[PDB]
Structure 1
Amino acid sequence: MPRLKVKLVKSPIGYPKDQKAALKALGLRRLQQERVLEDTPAIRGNVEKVAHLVRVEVV
């Protein structure tokens, strides 16, 4: 799977519980933090959900 690279770039302060929890699923705690993740449809499913807080690249 051509790996996904994600960066948290907006504060989740003010968004719903579940959205903050998807970030948690991903392992994104801090702002500007980047994580490299395999491209399974469950990984994608969550990143879909927090699309508006994250920029996404391919590796």
Structure 2
Amino acid sequence: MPRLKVKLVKSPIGYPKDQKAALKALGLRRLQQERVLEDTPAIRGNVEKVAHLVRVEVV
């Protein structure tokens, strides 16, 4: 499937540790940061659980 472009819009401060490790997994360091990743079931698996923190688009 075409690449995925995710962006962090809400801060993880005060969210469960797992949701922190998720963003670190995807490679989202600071806020408002861009990050495009070959979409696989494994990559979307984290994007899913952090959806309340990020806005995604297809590329």
The structure that is helix-richer by fraction is 1
How far the C-alpha of 1:3 sits from its partner, in A, is: 0.5
How far the C-alpha of 1:38 sits from its partner, in A, is: 0.6
Give runs of ≥4 in structure 1 deviating > 4 Å.
Answer: none
How far the C-alpha of 1:57 sits from its partner, in A, is: 0.4
TM-score w.r.t. length of structure 1: 0.97
1:5-54 Cα distance to aligned partner (Å, 9 max, x none): 00000000000000000000000011100100011000000000100000
Return the alpha-carbon distance in structure 1 between the equivalents of residues 22 and 30 of structure 2: 14
TM-score w.r.t. length of structure 2: 0.97
Identity level (%): 100
How far the C-alpha of 1:55 sits from its partner, in A, is: 0.2
Alignment of 1:15 with 2:39, yes or no, is no
Return the alpha-carbon distance in structure 2 between the equivalents of residues 58 and 47 of structure 1: 12
